[PDB]
């Protein structure tokens, strides 16, 4: 659906195309996405923002000199979005 | 100073997943020490598994395209012998082939090792054996290998002619058509082409193949270890000539 | 090919090599199909257990001593029973099965009086009481091809 | 108007994020890395982290080096005492490779033991145990099972167990898998050895065996209180109903601490 | 063993959809040692089916615990069974 409010928008991030990083073997692109949208009438902050509620980690594979390290970054893929 | 050719015959059968990393560390390591004692160095590569016919492989539609089924695992189908790399000086092209090699599978522990030895030996063209050089053929497998008349169970009764039977895919096209070669047939074609056969097997398979090397003239044996420089010591002490 | 169920063939007689070994005793003619494959009765396999047909005059019976519940390569699934055959002087059949027990091989002998009497076209695994068979041994004896000739 | 550059604001925020989680200032050199060879051993690691559809802090924001270790087969120690029975299933691991993937016990962050299910249909219940005094077994977790018609991949958070195993020099460890006990047997089909599979394919029949997935912090990293300025720190605010609202229709409670968030959060500002 | 009446449950919450959170809270007395507890549900008025589990800590003071049985209570308000209950046994080592 096409939301006018706080909806999670699609965004595929490529390492070679959108970052220019050829030092990360796997993956070579993933769906990180982002939250874009207004949140009208509800507290704490002076202006309620469209923030992500659920995020997902991403495993990566890169080398260190001659040593390949398979590591996993915490909270990269934006699944849901909330307003707080 | 003398030209030398080395063909690398790798067993891709199922029992080789525990021995795979030793072969890639043997390929790259061999693709380095060869340029030392000689400048005229060309090396090739070929792979084998088993004859793609029952009873050696299961004939169920899923286990034909994936013989590592029921485990489960994804592996290449069963093939007799594929000639991948003709022997050339380009040595980093050799390494790039050994790295991408995946495991295959079959059922019965002994393999179609002799079929690959026979095709790589006779084919002086599609393999490209030099005129006056040391035709060395490294044979690697962690199990026994089938010889003549063993294919009778599969329904193959036409003997191996010991000729070049590589199709446009550089594969053994007459694998399901011809029997495996015998030690007599192999001995008769490893001299017509003058080929020195190095057996590079596992510990439990040495006591077997060493008695084969006693029959096969010039053919020697070797042991596989994590430091596969052991087999390199064979070849360096085989450049003695004289 | 008999069906185990709808769209589920029970056997594969194509390329079964029936007539690969023929042995005759008086008015008895024994022929076998070493490359006969048979689908398991537990799941959908294609295992070459081998089968034989015996003709003692008019009656024609089937004989598949390796078509049992002992399935898979570990059992008699790849037995290829009937690869070699012969007759004794006391009306016993001698059958060789090179693929039994992960190709350890096996010899099976049944009395001809029991082969025809216990034959049932609706029974795919017939157990014979007077059956003589080389039972399975240690793993070192695999890939031996016992029963290649008799 | 807003525009589509918002996506590029995310990309340049991802750029500085990945480098900070890896504690890196610039991408490493790849001329000391060989192009081409990619082992299927690290492909099995990458495939097992993305696989988990089933199963249930300043240092937690950085990256964790994921390594795995397969178990010990039944060909050496798992048959010497109990073997396999309908009552329990035993899995064993070493420690010379556990203390090799994670040298120091403190580096360990999350250690989940993953298995391989087979089709089980309706219902089964599983209880997990730990090896204590090399003979006694202690409860861990429990899990109900769903009718999966297909092979399923699970995971059990045994982090507290693995951390204790890295502090002791215990040369041998392992687990035990029995079933539920209704008091006042076991019917689970997990990928095992089956004991009798031989031939050429037998060697690959030890694959997919239970392994312990490890996620630790590399040794190379090691090492309103983090700021001298009033950062985005939560500020105190006491709200009374009779004083700040004038509402006498609410009896209880008569006041609570409704705080608020005050502070900026910018990025990509001048000067590391 | 603990038992309740459905004639009063479907009076506080008429429709089962209105139910949002239903947590069962108890009262602990023993303060020494640590013990292991398993929770069950009443089925066929004789059989008990597993629910949840929780380990307990030696708190020097009387402690108050809670078990989230929302999914159980929701199904009980749809049934006309005017008698239900729970069971709290201990660990079974087998
Ligand atoms: C780790 O994961 C990676 C990917 O995440 C994996 O590499 C991939 O392996 C799969 C194997 O499932 C490959 O998928 C194959 O693709 C070919 C053609 O694209 C298909 O023909 C294959 O089909 C098989 O199965 C069919 C039955 O469903 C058969 O009919 C058929 O004949 C084939 O046997 C299969 O779908 C995929 O191509 C690769 N990826 C790349 C980029 O090559 C890797 O193997 C995993 N490592 C493990 C499991 O150890
Ligand atoms: C070997 O010599 C033959 C002629 O005797 C020639 O046709 C062939 O090209 C030579 N091979 C090589 C590799 O030079
Ligand atoms: Mn093999
Ligand atoms: Mn091996
Ligand atoms: Mn084989």
mmCIF file of C-alpha atoms and ligand atoms in Angstrom, chain B residues 11 13-15 109 111 142-143, chain D residues 200, ligand 3:
data_model
loop_
_atom_site.group_PDB
_atom_site.id
_atom_site.type_symbol
_atom_site.label_atom_id
_atom_site.label_comp_id
_atom_site.label_asym_id
_atom_site.label_seq_id
_atom_site.Cartn_x
_atom_site.Cartn_y
_atom_site.Cartn_z
ATOM 1 C CA UNK B 11 38.594 -37.884 -7.207
ATOM 2 C CA UNK B 13 33.540 -38.842 -5.073
ATOM 3 C CA UNK B 14 31.620 -38.603 -1.819
ATOM 4 C CA UNK B 15 34.416 -39.946 0.369
ATOM 5 C CA UNK B 109 33.176 -47.203 -2.195
ATOM 6 C CA UNK B 111 35.374 -45.635 -8.004
ATOM 7 C CA UNK B 142 40.638 -41.966 -0.880
ATOM 8 C CA UNK B 143 39.173 -45.341 -1.870
ATOM 9 C CA UNK D 200 31.212 -43.984 -0.560
HETATM 10 MN MN1 LIG F 3 34.645 -42.180 -2.919
#
